Amino acid sequence: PGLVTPLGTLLRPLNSEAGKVLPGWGTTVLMAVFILLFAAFLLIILEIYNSSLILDDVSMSWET
């Protein structure tokens, strides 16, 4: 018994799903795979930017 707007009627199924969370593990292992890939990606760009990992198309000459 609160206040009613047309947006209050519209957006209510977005604020409906309160608590429907999965038993078991779910997508946790896949999440771990994406986290390890993201960590490896950051390690790649960090060593490129430090130039501890010299590539071919990467100049690092303050020049392009």
């Binding site: 490896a40 390690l43 060593e47 501890s52 990992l53 010299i54 590539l55 071919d56």
Partner: protein, 35 residues
């Protein structure tokens, strides 16, 4: 087109995985031994 930097680099991504696998195997070798 692999430089020697990338050559000696990819062994580290191997080696860190081997270290974490050694951690996980050291967990499994005594944990499920006891239980």
């Amino acid at each position: 087109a692999v430089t020697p930097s990338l050559k000696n680099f990819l062994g580290s991504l191997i080696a860190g995985a081997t270290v974490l696998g050694g951690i996980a195997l050291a967990i499994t070798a005594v944990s499920k031994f006891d239980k």
